[model samples]
Target: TSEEHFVETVSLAGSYRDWSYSGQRTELGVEFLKRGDKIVYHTLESPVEFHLDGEVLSLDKLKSLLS
Candidate 1:
């Protein structure tokens, strides 16, 4: 089961946290679990990118998250 886990990189906005608008921003890799048609887990850093098994989550979900 753990062998199926994988990580992905994601980018997040600087305005959400009310921080000093660091131009550097933040990017991180998060781990996830793949179970058939769904992924279950949490992110290891900002800009969480959910992944199913070894594949990235759907673009629609990503767009929704950004929205």
Candidate 2:
């Protein structure tokens, strides 16, 4: 007998903090194997939101992606 594998897609939301007060918002779509806890996350292919903190309480929008 042989083992079979299948692909599954899912959406996940998480907060990643670097060297800033406001953390980064990440939305990722991943391809997972429907067997164990193994998955491969793809880069951001769609539009995403980026928030930056500055003086006088300001905000800006930027486009970015993850690899």
Candidate 3:
């Protein structure tokens, strides 16, 4: 027998810093995948550090952390 690998919808709940070029962002959330009347994938999912990039940091703080 063969199984079907089809997805109907994908739901995401989290914070993504889509504009941050330095990849400086924290993500924590659920990735729900639903197929028709079935809940296909219920994935559950952290970042707490700051990127030492000068662009997003303030007043030498970015460089300060490096020391």
Candidate 4:
């Protein structure tokens, strides 16, 4: 038998600051202009689909995967 590992999608529902290169994560809903059944933003594709709200952050902000 073998074991499997799962990493869930990450959602940035907060403010990210460039000054400190760090910010807080909150559930605060920000206005986003969009669609569905379509790949909103994807750097790569696989079994896991990543999702987010508001503006898309840079690669450094990319982390984790939704299971």
Tens-digit lDDT track of model 4 for 1-67: 0100112112333222211111132243212212232222332323223245534543334322110
Best-fitting candidate, scored by lDDT: 1
Clashing pairs in 3: none
List, residue by residue over 1-67, the lDDT tens digit for candidate 3: 0111111111122212221122112342222222233221221211111222112333244224322
TM-score of each: 0.27, 0.19, 0.17, 0.19
Pairs clashing in candidate 2? Answer: none
A best-first ranking of the candidates according to their TM-score comes to: 1, 4, 2, 3
lDDT order of candidates, best first? 1, 4, 3, 2
lDDT agreement with native, every candidate: 0.36, 0.21, 0.22, 0.26
User: Which residue window of length 10 is worst by lDDT in model 1?
Assistant: 2-11
Question: What are the RMSDs of all candidates, in order?
Answer: 12.3, 16.1, 18.8, 12.3
Clashing pairs in 1: none
- Compared with the true structure, what per-residue lDDT tens digits does model 1 show for residues 1-67? 2222222222133232221222332243432332235433334543344554545665466334333
lDDT of 3 at 64: 41
* Highest-TM-score candidate: 1
**Model 4 segments beyond 4 Å from truth?**
1-40, 43-51, 64-67
Q: Which pairs of residues collide in model 4?
A: 7-65, 8-65, 8-66, 9-65, 9-66
Q: Is candidate 1 or candidate 2 better by TM-score?
A: 1
- lDDT (Cα) of model 1: 0.36
